[PDB]
């Protein structure tokens, strides 16, 4: 599953 802190400017939603 993807790590959401690799780029915190991405909201996965």
């Amino acid at each position, epitope marked *: 599953n*993807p*790590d959401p*802190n*690799a*780029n*915190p*400017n991405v*909201d*996965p*939603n």
Partner: antibody
Amino acid sequence: QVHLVQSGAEVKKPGASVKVSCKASGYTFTSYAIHWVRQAPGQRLEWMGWIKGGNGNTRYSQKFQDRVTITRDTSASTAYMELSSLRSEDTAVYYCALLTVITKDDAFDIWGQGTMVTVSS
Amino acid sequence: DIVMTQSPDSLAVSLGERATINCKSSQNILYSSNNKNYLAWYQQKPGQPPKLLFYWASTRESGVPDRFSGSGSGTDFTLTISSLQAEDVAVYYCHQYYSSPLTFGGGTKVEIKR
């Protein structure tokens, strides 16, 4: 217009240190993270790390963890990358970038003009 | 370290011809919970910073002409320029933001046969 303006290119002797700066405008500086990316000669792009412009939390690549410090200044809306104990293999263009701002609100991607750092005696 | 492999490394076609650029992700970068691939495509002309073209593999950025499209999922992705124009001579980079460290493909140089 969102602009990332980056300090001028620099010559540095090996072992010394370089502090390149990234001035933000055109966007809420404290809401997004400033990434730093190296483009070494002929080689590919390399992510170095990011700092979050509100709370200042950083995360660093494992290639630069020990020699780079990224800091920000909320007042001047300016993020800074400092590389220390410079090697002649650090000669590259260094970029700051709001990498892939994909928020439910807005979507953009802005890079500064690059700062070329040459390490030489 | 998710390696991104671009094929070809250099392609040259005549004006108007279709250029296809393939990018392999070394790890599957689709997330089955939100049905998104975490890939971007960039364009870089000499002496200039890269310029985003696509996010979530297929989503075009504002400004990018419609001859550019992006497709792919899982481990295999594609950038297509349906009718190459002079402005498109550049180097193109794929890029993933699935995991840390953020990484980037090797690049594909695009030339025009004239």
